[PDB]
Amino acid sequence: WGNLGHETVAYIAQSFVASSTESFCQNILGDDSTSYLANVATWADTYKYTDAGEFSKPYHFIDAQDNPPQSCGVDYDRDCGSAGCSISAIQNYTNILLESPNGSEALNALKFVVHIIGDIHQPLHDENLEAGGNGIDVTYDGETTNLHHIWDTNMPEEAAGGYSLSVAKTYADLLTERIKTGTYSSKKDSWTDGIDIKDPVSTSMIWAADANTYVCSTVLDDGLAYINSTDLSGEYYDKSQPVFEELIAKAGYRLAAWLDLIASQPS
Ligand SMILES: Nc1ncnc2c1ncn2[C@@H]1O[C@H](COP(=O)(O)O)[C@@H](O)[C@H]1O
Ligand SMILES: *[C@@H]1O[C@H](CO)[C@@H](O)[C@H](O)[C@H]1NC(C)=O
Ligand SMILES: *[C@@H]1O[C@H](CO)[C@@H](O)[C@H](O)[C@H]1NC(C)=O
Ligand SMILES: [Ca+2]
Ligand SMILES: [Ca+2]
Ligand SMILES: [Ca+2]
Ligand code: NA
Ligand code: NA
Ligand SMILES: [Zn+2]
Ligand SMILES: [Zn+2]
Ligand SMILES: [Zn+2]
């Protein structure tokens, strides 16, 4: 996701973490503001464009080598790669926070977890094709862009009504209510099925696999003829909105559950 997406996920997590988890995190981050997670949710995206952080570029995604929209699937051993991926990163950085939450590495580890759990839920971050669709040019609201970009940025920002931190906060509130009492409230207790602090690879693979199903059902199900030749701000946006909104919600809720486990469970 772009910035609004990451901040939204983070504000959602803030609304579900236990009070003791909130403490734990605030302490690591040196920030007790009401935006403590949201304030760090985009950091990894800066860092990957620096010399020092170049190594972390692969940690944003897992390039699933499947055949959408006919066949979707992710496989850790097949798809992670020699430089690492989102899944291996969640393993590493979770372990750092489990075993060395007061070491020098904890602060970045936590910032990475916050960001990467968000990225795992962007379906095109779990797809190899055309570099997660970056190489697929599209039209959106009369302008040329690419498919990855409209998922990261144009569509969620249109849905939210903007792109700043304050807009992220309002969008997070909308989606948080959907989890607590609204249209996601009867499904959300299944969203944490299979979660296991002692098997970060399995756990993050569940999430990556879940998001990847939407590559087939939603992102590319219209086919490339339609994707290449229509303005995707019409019916395509209408079809995609309930999916990206649910996935952002899942990311925030799963992030909260994960942080709660980090702040409380043994290795
Ligand atoms: N699923 C993805 N989501 C976002 N960026 C990606 C994805 N897959 C590859 N990329 C980026 O696209 C570029 C080329 O990808 P590759 O040919 O897999 O090395 C690299 O800079 C990758 O970081
Ligand atoms: C684990 O984290 C350290 C600290 O950022 C990093 O330098 C190392 O490359 C990481 N390894 C993996 C496999 O994520
Ligand atoms: C759609 O465009 C992509 C490149 O952006 C190309 O790979 C693909 O073959 C095109 N498909 C059709 C049916 O035009
Ligand atoms: Ca942006
Ligand atoms: Ca139910
Ligand atoms: Ca359950
Ligand atoms: Na790759
Ligand atoms: Na611990
Ligand atoms: Zn992102
Ligand atoms: Zn992206
Ligand atoms: Zn990212």
Which characteristics define this entry?
monomer, 267 residues, mainly alpha, P1 Nuclease, two-stranded antiparallel ribbon, 2 strands, 59% helix, binds adenosine monophosphate, binds 2-acetamido-2-deoxy-beta-D-glucopyranose, binds calcium ion, binds sodium ion
What do we call the CATH topology? P1 Nuclease
CATH superfamily grouping = P1 Nuclease
Shape: globular
For the largest sheet, list the strands in their spatial order: 1-2
Query: What's the β-strand tally?
Result: 2
- Can you tell me the CATH class? Mainly Alpha
Task: Please state the second-level CATH architecture.
Answer: Orthogonal Bundle
Small molecules (ligands, ions, cofactors) in the structure: adenosine monophosphate, 2-acetamido-2-deoxy-beta-D-glucopyranose, calcium ion, sodium ion, zinc ion
| Order of helical and strand elements | HHHHHHHEEHHHHHH
Strand content: under 5%
Radius of gyration, rounded? 17 Å
Note the main sheet. Answer: 2 strands, antiparallel
The level of helicity is: 55-70%
Number of helices: 13
Number of domains: 1
| Cα separation of the termini | 31 Å
Structural class call reads mainly alpha
InterPro entries: Peptidase_S8_Asp-AS, PLipase_C/P1_nuclease_dom_sf, S1/P1nuclease
Subunit structure: Monomer.
Organism: Aspergillus oryzae (strain ATCC 42149 / RIB 40) (Yellow koji mold)
Protein name: Nuclease S1
